[PDB]
Amino acid sequence: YEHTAVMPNKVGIPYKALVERPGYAPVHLQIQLVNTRIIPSTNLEYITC
Amino acid sequence: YEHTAVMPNKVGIPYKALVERPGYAPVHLQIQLVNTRIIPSTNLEYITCKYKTKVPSPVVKCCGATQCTSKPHPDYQCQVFSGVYPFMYGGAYCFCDTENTQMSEAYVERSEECSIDHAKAYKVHTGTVQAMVNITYGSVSWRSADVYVNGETPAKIGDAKLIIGPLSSAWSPFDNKVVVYGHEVYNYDFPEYGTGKAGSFGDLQSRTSTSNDLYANTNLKLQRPQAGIVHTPFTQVPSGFERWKKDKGAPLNDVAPFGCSIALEPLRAENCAVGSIPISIDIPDAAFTRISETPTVSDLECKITECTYAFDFGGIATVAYKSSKAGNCPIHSPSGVAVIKENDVTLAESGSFTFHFSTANIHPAFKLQVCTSAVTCKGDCKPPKDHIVDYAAQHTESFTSAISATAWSWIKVLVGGTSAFIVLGLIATAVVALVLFFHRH
Ligand SMILES: *[C@@H]1O[C@H](CO)[C@@H](O)[C@H](O)[C@H]1NC(C)=O
């Protein structure tokens, strides 16, 4: 059963929801981000020293 | 006690009802069709298959001539070719160079494959309709028997005498002419026996696969043998059976409406969901219990806790109750709004029980009958999640099933608004007309 939602982009703050499937008891869902990493693409132009 | 009703002609969907016998508690009745078979009356017209051309040894008459005679063979051909000078491994066969004649003969016969690879052309007329039913009543478990859907022949199922009426529709998927090839049936208007044309399906026709009288209509033409060669060349239109097998098209098994399944032994259409079936079942008297002998149910309150108008039993409801004797109690919803999954429940002195139901209505409102009592259930239902399901719906959708309370409010506002606005004009006209009358008087 697919559950779709929007959670805030916060680390350490868990997102809580009840997965309500018709005819079945709700299943508690908890999604928490441990870390988020933005990894850009880099090209070395030159080295200075 | 005889119970008469009409159930839909739907295979796999059970028909549920309560048998209400005055003086006795209602007995729950459930009838389910196991299969439905339309068995038309068929008459084999002829058998068609690929032809085989039999060519006897030609008569090579050296220094003379011979004459062809007719023979009782299918598509028999005989032609005398004069002026032949055949050669063989041993040299020139004949001495004379011109007064020399070859008589060629050829005829059509059934191929060996015709014993296995052939099509049967049948004339189809109306015939017997049969069905198999699965029935329960009271405490008696499932019983089944094969019955005739004609409304005259009764069947004894678990000591109950069942009469199944004729189908409300005489529709049948077979035309007046069908061609049976292998496991497939084709609604093909085959040519009558003796009128088949070369290159078409009926080019070869036989009354039976073992018949000694074969009709063959091919353009079998004897050609002149090549110079110096002893052979019987001929030209013939390619077999119309092989041509048909390429062009036979879609069989009735693939295009029959209403999901009919076609079977060949005997030829029949199965599980056609067409119309409804009147029924009459006589429930044994021993199955009925007096009112005073059954538990009395009161203080009923029905709460729908979940509901989706899905094809399955997407609804769940809780019924609170109080009853004496704390016995078993039939449960049924006579209204078509919702179909109840449970047939009966066990009741205590007081408590509640739950049941499941299927409904197409966005706001279900149905009467639930509880042995000797009844309660009204109301609620709201959510749309289903699955767009496509692999099973047929357990409920019947009505015209007003989709109308929500919001839509009903708008309908009442629109209808009430226009009606009230028109009525105002009519009243205003009548009032002013009366005022003018009193102006004169
Ligand atoms: C009748 O329905 C019951 C349901 O439990 C099933 O076990 C039984 O096989 C059915 N009858 C036939 C003939 O299939």
Side-chain angles (χ1 to χ4, degrees):
Chain A
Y1 183 75
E2 184 181 4
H3 174 72
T4 61
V6 176
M7 67 177 289
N9 183 8
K10 295 177 183 181
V11 173
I13 301 299
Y15 165 82
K16 299 186 181 191
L18 287 178
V19 180
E20 294 174 0
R21 181 182 179 189
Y24 293 84
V27 173
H28 196 277
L29 169 68
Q30 187 175 0
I31 299 174
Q32 180 176 308
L33 302 176
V34 177
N35 67 62
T36 307
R37 315 183 300 275
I38 297 170
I39 307 168
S41 173
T42 59
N43 292 106
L44 180 68
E45 190 66 24
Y46 59 85
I47 282 176
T48 298
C49 63
Chain B
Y1 186 78
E2 182 180 9
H3 172 73
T4 61
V6 179
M7 66 179 182
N9 185 13
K10 292 178 181 179
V11 176
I13 305 299
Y15 162 84
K16 298 187 185 192
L18 291 177
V19 179
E20 296 178 349
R21 181 180 182 196
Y24 299 79
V27 176
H28 193 273
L29 168 65
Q30 186 175 2
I31 304 171
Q32 182 176 320
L33 291 164
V34 181
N35 62 62
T36 305
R37 315 185 301 275
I38 298 171
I39 308 168
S41 178
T42 58
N43 180 42
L44 181 68
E45 190 73 34
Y46 59 81
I47 282 177
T48 301
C49 63
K50 185 180 182 171
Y51 70 71
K52 191 175 78 77
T53 308
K54 181 59 179 180
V55 178
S57 300
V59 187
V60 183
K61 184 62 179 179
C62 305
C63 298
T66 191
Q67 311 77 39
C68 279
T69 69
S70 67
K71 294 186 183 174
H73 309 297
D75 208 6
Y76 183 78
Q77 306 299 321
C78 191
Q79 193 165 348
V80 186
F81 302 103
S82 65
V84 296
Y85 197 78
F87 293 92
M88 297 184 188
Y89 83 84
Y93 186 77
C94 295
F95 184 84
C96 298
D97 51 342
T98 46
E99 298 75 355
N100 190 344
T101 309
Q102 177 179 317
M103 181 175 71
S104 296
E105 300 185 51
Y107 59 98
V108 180
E109 65 178 358
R110 294 183 297 272
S111 68
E112 307 174 3
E113 300 77 351
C114 294
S115 67
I116 72 167
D117 195 30
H118 64 256
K120 295 182 177 181
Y122 287 99
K123 289 281 177 65
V124 183
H125 312 289
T126 58
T128 312
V129 180
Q130 297 180 344
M132 184 174 186
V133 292
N134 210 7
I135 292 187
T136 74
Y137 64 87
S139 64
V140 179
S141 62
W142 293 97
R143 297 293 182 278
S144 62
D146 193 73
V147 305
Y148 288 74
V149 181
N150 64 12
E152 299 178 352
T153 305
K156 184 181 178 182
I157 306 170
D159 303 321
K161 186 180 179 180
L162 176 77
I163 294 170
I164 296 296
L167 303 183
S168 69
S169 177
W171 180 92
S172 177
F174 307 110
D175 285 344
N176 63 316
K177 285 183 177 179
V178 305
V179 175
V180 179
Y181 178 60
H183 68 290
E184 293 169 339
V185 184
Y186 297 82
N187 277 329
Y188 185 77
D189 184 7
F190 58 81
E192 300 300 310
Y193 183 82
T195 69
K197 304 298 181 181
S200 186
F201 171 75
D203 64 357
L204 190 78
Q205 302 171 333
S206 184
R207 286 298 194 184
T208 67
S209 61
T210 60
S211 176
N212 293 321
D213 187 358
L214 185 65
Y215 167 84
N217 188 24
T218 79
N219 299 334
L220 182 56
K221 310 295 177 182
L222 295 165
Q223 304 299 337
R224 190 182 180 84
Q226 296 296 308
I229 295 146
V230 180
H231 70 159
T232 305
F234 67 84
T235 59
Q236 197 175 22
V237 169
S239 181
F241 180 64
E242 290 293 315
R243 184 270 185 93
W244 175 78
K245 287 192 291 178
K246 296 173 187 176
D247 301 334
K248 63 189 186 296
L252 187 56
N253 305 48
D254 300 341
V255 306
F258 301 104
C260 300
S261 174
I262 308 300
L264 298 186
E265 293 186 356
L267 173 65
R268 64 194 187 270
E270 298 197 350
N271 305 341
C272 300
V274 191
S276 66
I277 311 179
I279 65 169
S280 173
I281 183 166
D282 184 342
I283 305 298
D285 58 331
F288 297 85
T289 302
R290 301 301 297 268
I291 296 290
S292 63
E293 291 172 355
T294 63
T296 297
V297 184
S298 189
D299 195 21
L300 290 167
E301 180 177 358
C302 181
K303 176 185 175 182
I304 291 176
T305 63
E306 170 65 307
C307 188
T308 301
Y309 47 87
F311 288 6
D312 199 359
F313 293 95
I316 312 176
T318 301
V319 181
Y321 69 89
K322 291 186 171 67
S323 77
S324 66
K325 301 188 180 185
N328 182 277
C329 184
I331 302 297
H332 178 56
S333 171
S335 176
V337 165
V339 181
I340 313 304
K341 188 175 182 180
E342 289 80 2
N343 295 333
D344 63 72
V345 295
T346 302
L347 304 183
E349 295 80 3
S350 64
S352 68
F353 67 84
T354 64
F355 70 85
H356 304 73
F357 64 92
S358 185
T359 185
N361 298 288
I362 189 162
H363 297 289
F366 58 87
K367 176 185 177 182
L368 187 82
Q369 290 185 277
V370 182
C371 63
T372 76
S373 192
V375 61
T376 300
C377 301
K378 296 183 182 179
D380 308 331
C381 305
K382 296 180 286 287
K385 75 185 183 68
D386 306 325
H387 304 295
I388 311 289
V389 297
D390 65 332
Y391 54 81
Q394 297 294 307
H395 58 247
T396 301
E397 178 178 300
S398 183
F399 175 73
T400 59
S401 293
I403 307 174
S404 65
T406 300
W408 272 124
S409 180
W410 278 110
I411 292 164
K412 289 176 180 180
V413 164
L414 293 174
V415 173
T418 59
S419 180
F421 197 55
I422 293 167
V423 167
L424 176 63
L426 295 172
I427 290 173
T429 298
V431 171
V432 75
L434 184 60
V435 168
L436 296 174
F437 179 87
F438 289 125
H439 284 166
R440 296 194 293 269
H441 299 279

